[model samples]
Target: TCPFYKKIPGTGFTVDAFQYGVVEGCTAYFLTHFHSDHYAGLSKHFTFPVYCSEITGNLLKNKLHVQEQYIHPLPLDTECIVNGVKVVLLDANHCPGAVMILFYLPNGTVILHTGDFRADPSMERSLLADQKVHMLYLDTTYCSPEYTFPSQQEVIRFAINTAFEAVTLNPHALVVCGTYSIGKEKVFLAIADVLGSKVGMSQEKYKTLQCLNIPEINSLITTDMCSSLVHLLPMMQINFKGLQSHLKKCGGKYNQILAFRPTGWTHSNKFTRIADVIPQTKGNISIYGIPYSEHSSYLEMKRFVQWLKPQKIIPTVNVGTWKSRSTMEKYFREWKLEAGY
Candidate 1:
């Protein structure tokens, strides 16, 4: 689905909508984060250089390396005009580079776009609540009751608990965790802080952490020195076999590795990297498989709507799904995109 396109308005199917990029002459566009949904249409809109935060700009540049035809990168808290509309970027707390955009049209209408944000208080406070807001565009990806996302701190604690328990059972054992390449560094840092030293990490992972400014995040952490007692190491393999092989070199009874990768065996072919290393030892490994998501859940979405106190709420993104529609009707008015949320 990276480049999915729809063909329509033709005797035969024609290119009605495509994902390569955005159409030319479009006034303004912004990418909330590097997530698939936001970046999928990059090529289409890159021609005009969409606006984004400095962190996001760095990530995109590091990944795409575009030189010409790029917008001037602006840091959060900076205000700029996109499509002749004033816009401000605020931390979304969903991911490292994720941000929420507050769009202010010249007509005095205000719109807040929560780009893949969860209800993180730190992120909410970062947005400066004094600004008058007219409408709010929200993310409702997990409106279904099936999801109750665990907080980042909760997930980090789980990771530590699982790792320590595994270590106690097999002192020489290596613990492995697989997570998204971008935002999961926080989890790694949490582990390092808890361990009081560096945990095992691949050179590649270390390099990524440094680039993301995570290796030096000690300046931001407020935990007491005693809270930081565990140590971590890095390994170079993403697959289970590769991770296990690397862990074995540590010369410990557990010889465990914590990696984040898709197992590839799930129905949607989602994360399944576990079976590759210990096809038989899956039970031995303790996976803190909590649903740590960046987007808002339905319950969280409702709470956010209540907190924002928008005149009206409009759900952007997920439209066709049952949960999405249900969320709109239950919490926000259907249609009325121009109205407040």
Candidate 2:
């Protein structure tokens, strides 16, 4: 939350600060990843030296068009002194170029900042697993017990089968998948891989994928819209209104459109509970939402904190006020009371 400023307390360094302007004593700045929410408030006018993973820095330079002079791309797992504080970057497994930032203070305090991550078991064996963490800045977007989602592979399977069925039923129809600039590559990649087809995308997205340097994905993309029936565009572009115009623009080459909105919300009891979230069809266009989460589930966070057992936890999201803060804080306290945590 930065509690509002998104600042690292007791330090002059600000992390992900654009909307919140003019810190009293900011000597340096940091960026966790290239996601719009994290990178918000950032633009060409930024005046401070920005630090992040090399992949994230490349994305900023090429995608956001920020000058390379201000971007400081650090090597993953290498400890370096920035503004006199020792810090290292670890793979977060959140998105294409995401990272978990770890800092070692002069006072021997170890603070780990997880910026929107999927907590996999492999992280338990990392160098951080051996440390006695003084504080853990956690990603608490799915802090509650209600956000129980299946594995990514399961959702990808469902999406592929659904798209295959819809297209097979109507060969002339096209499958439009909604995705972010970085995350959800597995969904479309598998769909294209399994279906033996190419994916159509804009050059902007193509350049974004190009930054990843993933050779398999590189071979599956096309700038030509008509070369492939599966058009993987931004999430907002898959709406009925957009798809309606897309169909007309194609001039009836594809008579039907099947749109997939792959998101984690589909699994939440707070939402439609997956099977209840039926596919909606209007004329020849159908919208189907699938559970595809880049963030960790509630259980994933629970397991991670229990294993790491940080001395204190700082939530990065869903901590707007005292009411909402305690609602999210209770889980960590409960986990702490369990003795092992």
Candidate 3:
């Protein structure tokens, strides 16, 4: 169970987790994004005011049926006062509508909560200009040297190219790219635009795109597989077993199926991580892992912390009471790189 809430010392400001039994005494709630893991426990039944990006608010209201009055849609890069604390929402560069929260506490301390974001040069410049982060909350999903990988843009380019090549090699084969329900709209949009093909997805995903209402994205969405050659399936469906079952049934319809997983975990294999592009073939199914991730790599996380130089660092994930102290120490190094100093 990852810790979803962050409390700024003596400031009465709460970040993220708004679920019951998570953090009881916090005064105001701020959501970094709409990822289920981060945006858990929110529903239509709740009454407390929840602040998030305009996109997030729309999704909560339209998709999740959360009440409108309680959902505050804050514009990005704009400063506003919330509960007497000066707050600004900056682009997190993770996914659509994701933001990094900056809080200027009443006591003159500044806190930054990077809700699951990758390193962007522009974001770095803004943080460096501030240079007075007293407390930093990190998204340490990959907090080790082994997690180093290419940038998201590079990975997306490679994925788009590889996908196109796969379909070209097997004209009769259906190309399926694995993606999260919401995060990787860029991959699908790019693939559709470049390949001159419609991108297909599940109906649930279709509804989400409908709410987003981006013409470029909406135009690409299709539920009919016959009308489209490239399909975007949930990552869960891209697994070997799942694909095997689906292909077993559709074997007669399509000549072959080419599968690609755009994720950071492909970098799990040391060999694949260094290779220009790696693809694994099992019978008629060929699978490739593209180094696409929304979260920061360990090196990026380390560099971000080093730049911020916060007096205290907190880990946003896996902060159970029993393992809280040790987990915090493992992820949060002080300004001198000392553990739990």
Candidate 4:
């Protein structure tokens, strides 16, 4: 990963990468989100000063028991002076605490780090489209032309409708959803609201949600297993074998298991774009592998770059080799990064 480097060039900032102890000249460390991919080396022993969204500041303490004295939590949409650099935070639309960072250097170079975002229309309207970014740290999770999937709202709508049809056919159907610590909140919440069911989750995940301090969300979730049939579990816990055995273990008279695995990996095609909901079945148990993603797909990423017109584009996800980087480079070239220079 490009974030593997402990420090940013020509800056006293170290972001998201902390495996190698501490940088000698680092003035401050910026964290994009609470995802393990970004906050990998963070531990209680970590001694560096950290900056992030207010929600993630609580998360660091709630999860890792990090000291509050070392954290600087900035509210979203506010511009502040951090060590003489004008910085601002924008919602990344990837996870609950995720945020894209904007940095205006003293020399007037504008750098935007898309810390794993989905490029919907709202981000552009947040004052990013007109501003010419000098450099961009892109979220290249789905960088290839093959990742052609439908918009997030379209997918969520379809998933809810499909799930409703499944429940309509069998009234006693159990809804089991797969999710991460902070992602897919919108998906399950929408389905739960539509089905008139409260979400059932583990005590730990329940505590994780409490970190946000949003009363509206806190009211929708419950740790009581029998209170609702809509369950949220870890991704690995929603497999066919897992679902089959879980259904057997419940003994709650649930007729069938209608599961949803909301992720981007399910939508794999050359160029065909559609709302693809892949399925796997074991008798009455069906697992729908939805192509819904938190990261931007191929078309979405291209659209964002075309409007951005950044002078230098850097890959934050797939940054392994020269050849590997070049594969992603072709798309950027077509988007006119080559011609713009």
For candidate 1, what is the TM-score?
A: 0.70
Worst 10 residues of 4 by lDDT: 267-276
What lDDT score goes with residue 37 in model 1? 52
lDDT of 2 by residue, 1-341 (tens): 33433667656677777566656677777888888878887777777788998888888888787888998989988889998888888999888778988888777888888988999898998878667888888999888888888788777777778778777788898888897658888877777776667888888888888887576765798888887888887788788888898889786799998888877654344655444557888999898877788888999988998989899888888867787688887888899899565
Clashes of each: 48, 1, 1, 0
Worst 10 residues of 3 by lDDT: 332-341
Q: Which tens-of-lDDT digit does each residue in 1-341 have in candidate 1?
A: 21112211111211112254544333444677766556654542355555677766766666655453574566777777654556678888777777877766666767777777776545446554766676666676665555554455655666666556555666554445464456655555555555445544444444444445454554433323222223222323445565556545544544454443322122221333222222233533323333456666556766666556676555665676786677657646532332343
Scanning candidate 1 in windows of ten residues, the lowest lDDT window is 7-16
Candidate 1 residues lying further than 4 Å off, grouped into runs, are 1-20, 41-46, 82-84, 121-128, 199-207, 215-284, 333-341
TM-score of each: 0.70, 0.91, 0.86, 0.92
lDDT of 3: 0.74
Q: Which parts of model 4 have CA positions greater than 4 angstroms off?
A: 1-6, 213-215, 267-278, 337-341
Which segments of model 2 are wrong by more than 4 Å?
1-5, 267-277
Between prediction 2 and prediction 3, which has the larger TM-score? 2
Residue pairs in collision within model 3? 2-318
The RMSD of every model to the true structure, in order and in angstroms, is: 8.4, 2.4, 3.4, 2.4
lDDT of 2: 0.81
C-alpha lDDT score of every prediction, in listed order: 0.53, 0.81, 0.74, 0.81
